[PDB]
Amino acid sequence: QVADLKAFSKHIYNAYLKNFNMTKKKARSILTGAPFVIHDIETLWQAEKGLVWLPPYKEISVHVFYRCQCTTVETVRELTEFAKSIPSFSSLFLNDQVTLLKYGVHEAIFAMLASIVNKDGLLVANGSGFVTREFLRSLRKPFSDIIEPKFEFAVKFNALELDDSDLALFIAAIILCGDRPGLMNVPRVEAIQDTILRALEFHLQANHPDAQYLFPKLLQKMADLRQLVTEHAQMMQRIKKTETETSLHPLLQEIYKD
Amino acid sequence: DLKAFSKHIYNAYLKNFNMTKKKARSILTGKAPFVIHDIETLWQAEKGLVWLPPYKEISVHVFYRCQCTTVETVRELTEFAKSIPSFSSLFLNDQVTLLKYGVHEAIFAMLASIVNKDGLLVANGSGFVTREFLRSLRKPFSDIIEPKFEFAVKFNALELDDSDLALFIAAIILCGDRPGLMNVPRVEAIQDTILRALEFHLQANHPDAQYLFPKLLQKMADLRQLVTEHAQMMQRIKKTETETSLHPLLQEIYKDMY
Ligand SMILES: CCCCCCOc1ccc(C[C@H](CC)C(=O)O)cc1CNC(=O)c1ccc(C(F)(F)F)cc1
Ligand SMILES: CCCCCCOc1ccc(C[C@H](CC)C(=O)O)cc1CNC(=O)c1ccc(C(F)(F)F)cc1
Ligand SMILES: CCCCCCCO[C@@H]1O[C@H](CO)[C@@H](O)[C@H](O)[C@H]1O
Ligand SMILES: CCCCCCCO[C@@H]1O[C@H](CO)[C@@H](O)[C@H](O)[C@H]1O
How many A from CA of A216 to the centre of ligand 1? 28
Q: For A79, which residue in chain B has the nearest alpha carbon? A: B92
Q: What are the CB-based long-range contacts (under 8 Å, 24+) for B133-137?
A: B133/B36, B133/B37, B133/B38, B133/B42, B134/B62, B137/B58, B137/B59, B137/B62
- Cis peptide before A142, with omega less than 30 degrees from 0? yes
Angle between helices A60-84 and A164-175 (to 10 degrees): 90
Question: Which of B36, B62, B120, B149 gets mutated to test ligand 2 (max ligand atoms within 8 A of its CB)?
Answer: B120
Contacts of B249 in chain A (CB under 8 A): 93, 95, 184
Chain gaps in chain B, named by the residue before each (C–N > 2.5 Å): 31, 51
Phi and psi torsions of B88, nearest 5°? -65, -20
CA atoms of A166 and A169, how far apart (whole Å): 6
User: Which residues share a beta bridge with A121?
Assistant: A118, A132
β-strands B127-130, B34-36 pairing: parallel
CA atoms of A184 and A192, how far apart (whole Å): 14
Residue type, A185: N
Best B93, B97, B249, B250 member to test A by mutation, with max A CBs in 10 Å, is B93
Which residues are CB-neighbours of B164 under 8 A, at least 6 positions away? B198, B201, B202, B205, B206, B216
> Which is nearest to B119 in space by CA: B143, B152, B142, B157?
B152
CA atoms of B221 and B177, how far apart (whole Å): 12
- Could you tell me if B182 and B93 are in contact, meaning their C-beta atoms sit under 8 angstroms apart? yes
Please report, for residues A62, A134, A243, B77, the alpha-carbon distance to residue A58 in angstroms, rounded to integers and kept in the order given.
7, 21, 12, 44
> Which is nearest to A117 in space by CA: A89, A157, A87?
A157
Q: Does the beta-carbon distance from A250 to B95 stay under 8 Å?
A: no
The 3-state DSSP class for residue A244 equals coil
> What does R_g of chain B's alpha carbons equal in angstroms?
18
CA atoms of A152 and A150, how far apart (whole Å): 5
- Tell the residue nearest (CA) to atom 6 of ligand 1: A147
CA atoms of A220 and A203, how far apart (whole Å): 18
Q: Find the helix or strand (DSSP H, E) in which A36 lies.
A: strand A36-38
What are the DSSP calls for A164-189, one per residue? HHHHHHHHHHHHS-TT-TT-S-HHHH
> Which is nearest to B114 in space by CA: B101, B131, B100?
B131
Q: Strand order of the sheet with strand A36-38? A: A36-38, A129-132, A121-124, A117-118
- Tell the residue nearest (CA) to atom 32 of ligand 1: A64
Which residues 51-90 of A have a C-beta within 8 angstroms of B?
80
Cite the DSSP H helix spans in chain A.
2-19, 24-30, 41-46, 60-84, 94-113, 133-137, 148-158, 164-175, 186-207, 214-242, 250-256
How many A from CA of B143 to the centre of ligand 2? 12
Q: Does the beta-carbon distance from A94 to B93 stay under 8 Å?
A: no
Q: For B97, which residue in chain A has the nearest alpha carbon? A: A95
Contacts of B77 in chain A (CB under 8 A): none
CA atoms of B232 and B241, how far apart (whole Å): 14
- Cis peptide before B140, with omega less than 30 degrees from 0? yes
Angle at CA of residue B111, ends A95 and B225, nearest 5°: 70
> Which is nearest to A76 in space by CA: B98, B92, B97?
B92
Q: Find the helix or strand (DSSP H, E) in which A37 lies.
A: strand A36-38
CA atoms of B27 and B242, how far apart (whole Å): 38
Please report, for residues A194, B198, B204, B205, B224, the alpha-carbon distance to residue B3 in angstroms, rounded to integers and kept in the order given.
48, 10, 10, 12, 28
Which residues are CB-neighbours of B18 under 8 A, at least 6 positions away? B76, B124
State the smallest CA–CA distance between residue B92 and chain A in angstroms.
6
Q: Find the helix or strand (DSSP H, E) in which A211 lies.
A: none
User: Which residues share a beta bridge with A39?
Assistant: none
Residue A55 gets which letter from DSSP? P
What are the DSSP calls for chain B, one per residue? -HHHHHHHHHHHHHHH-SS-HHHHHHHHHT--PEEE-SHHHHHHIIIII---PPP--HHHHHHHHHHHHHHHHHHHHHHHHHTSTTTTTS-HHHHHHHHHHHHHHHHHHHHGGGEETTEEEETTTTEEEEHHHHHTSPTTGGGGTHHHHHHHHHHHTT---HHHHHHHHHHHHS-TT-TT-S-HHHHHHHHHHHHHHHHHHHHHH-TT-SSHHHHHHHHHHHHHHHHHHHHHHHHHHHHH-TTS---HHHHHHGGG--
Nearest ligand, CA of residue B257? 3
Residue A107 gets which letter from DSSP? H
Q: How many residues does chain B have?
A: 258
Question: How many other C-beta atoms can be found within 10 angstroms of the C-beta atom of residue A220?
Answer: 11
The 3-state DSSP class for residue A86 equals coil
Contacts of B91 in chain A (CB under 8 A): 80, 251
Contacts of A93 in chain B (CB under 8 A): 74, 78, 249
Angle between helices B184-205 and B162-173 (to 10 degrees): 160
> Which is nearest to A105 in space by CA: A125, A82, A129?
A82
User: Which residues share a beta bridge with B121?
Assistant: B128
CA atoms of B10 and B166, how far apart (whole Å): 5
Q: For A255, which residue in chain B has the nearest alpha carbon? A: B93
Residue A143 gets which letter from DSSP? G
State the smallest CA–CA distance between residue A91 and chain B in angstroms.
10
Phi and psi torsions of B116, nearest 5°? -125, -170
Residue type, A99: T
Nearest ligand, CA of residue B181? 4
> What does R_g of chain A's alpha carbons equal in angstroms?
19
